[PDB]
UniProtKB/Swiss-Prot annotation:
Active site, UniProt feature: 169, 276
Gene: man1
EC number: 3.2.1.78
Span within the parent record: 28 to 371 of 437
Annotated protein name in UniProt: Mannan endo-1,4-beta-mannosidase A
Region annotated Catalytic, chain positions: 1-344
Organism: Hypocrea jecorina (strain ATCC 56765 / BCRC 32924 / NRRL 11460 / Rut C-30)
Length: 344
């Protein structure tokens, strides 16, 4: 079947089936220009049994790129432009078309915290302030909400959207945690006002939670309070990410990070999505326990590793990093086929 993704209990209902899901991150899927490369990648993700793919919903620039290069929005002090041409949001339209054909669902964030593909910094270049004043910078927020409308109105009645996501890893370093609570509240109310069919979430890493062991990710240095955020009425589920190598923690600390977040989601009466994770060293050994904790903890609705890697008919490989799990590799067998088989 094909219906809108909803929540039943503290699980997701995807095409009429209520139960845990596995998915993957494919930020780069959104920028593929050859339709055959979106088709082969989505064929592989679907035939692997994954149900949800997270793709970027942004590609922000301050200067127009070399002719032929993809860009979705040009941010300027004197008038910004949202690109709906063939080198713009039509590349994301094909990703949604292919998700519909392959019975896949998509999580789509609207801005990056980080400067990759522009991010908050491309708004600060156009509209002044800095990365923490961005949240209440009227000109930057007015353009951000114009871009949110331009993306949400294309797919608001498509059954292939799993959830809209306010941003990738929003932080407010050193800020009061109320700055992101009030921004997330207002912006998720706005997204609900444009689309009543789809779920909405924040896209944060889950930093700031007092039920942990006091490591830096549980403290409040990055402007986020997980328990305050998941209680926002217009956010339907919580997200959290996990990178012990970057965070200075050991890999086994990841299980308690999953458990504490899951319990905070369930205390708020909602599901959690373990939305990104990776280990740079020995990923099959170090990430498989995390997948089993997530599958077996009440409050979790699904998990998505960072990240899918694939290769195309002409012999080119996709973008990648040290966390890529290449389709058909031995790490794919360990972290994708074995995990889908455990779920069902
Ligand atoms: C960002 O701007 C605000 C307001 O001027 C200021 O209070 C804060 O210190 C600035 N951040 C940095 C890192 O300078
Ligand atoms: C599209 O979805 C909106 C709810 O977000 C609904 O009001 C509208 O009727 C739907 N459009 C069609 C053509 O069904
Ligand atoms: C994937 O592996 C199978 C062998 O297990 C092979 O039949 C198929 O051609 C491979 N797919 C790609 C895209 O290489
Ligand atoms: C590191 O993690 C915890 C501290 O959070 C410690 O008790 C545990 O023994 C260590 N585990 C490994 C395998 O390093």
């Amino acid at each position: 079947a094909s219906s809108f993704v909803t929540i039943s209990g503290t699980q997701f209902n995807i095409d009429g089936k209520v139960g845990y899901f596995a998915g993957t991150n494919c930020y780069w899927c959104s920028f593929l220009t050859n339709h055959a490369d979106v088709d082969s990648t989505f064929s592989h993700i679907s035939s692997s049994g994954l149900k949800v793919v997270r793709v970027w919903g942004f590609n922000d620039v301050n200067t127009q790129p070399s002719p032929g290069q993809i860009w979705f929005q040009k941010l300027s002090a004197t008038g910004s432009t949202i690109n709906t041409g063939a080198d713009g949001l039509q590349t994301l339209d094909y990703v949604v078309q292919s998700a519909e054909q392959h019975n896949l669902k998509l999580i789509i964030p609207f801005v990056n915290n980080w400067s990759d593909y522009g991010g908050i910094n491309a708004y600060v270049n156009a509209f002044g302030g800095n990365a923490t004043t961005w949240y209440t910078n009227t000109a930057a927020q007015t353009q951000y909400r114009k871009y949110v409308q331009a993306v949400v109105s294309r797919y608001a009645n498509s059954t292939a959207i799993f959830a809209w996501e306010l941003g990738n890893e929003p932080r407010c370093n050193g800020c009061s945690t109320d700055v992101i609570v009030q921004w997330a509240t207002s912006v998720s109310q706005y997204v609900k006002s444009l689309d009543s069919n789809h779920l909405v979430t924040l896209g944060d890493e889950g930093l700031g939670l007092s039920t942990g062991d006091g490591a830096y990710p549980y403290t409040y240095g990055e402007g986020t309070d997980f328990a305050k955020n998941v209680q926002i009425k217009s956010l339907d589920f919580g997200t959290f990410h996990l990178y012990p190598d970057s965070w200075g923690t050991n890999y086994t600390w990841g299980n308690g990070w999953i458990q504490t977040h899951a319990a905070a989601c369930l205390a708020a009466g909602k599901p959690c999505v373990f939305e990104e994770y990776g280990a740079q060293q020995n990923p099959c050994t170090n990430e498989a326990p995390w997948q089993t904790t997530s599958l077996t903890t009440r409050g979790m609705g699904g998990d998505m590793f960072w990240q899918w890697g694939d290769t195309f008919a002409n012999g080119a490989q996709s973008n990648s990093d040290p966390y890529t799990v290449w389709y058909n590799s031995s790490n794919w067998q360990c972290l994708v086929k074995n995990h889908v088989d455990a779920i069902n």
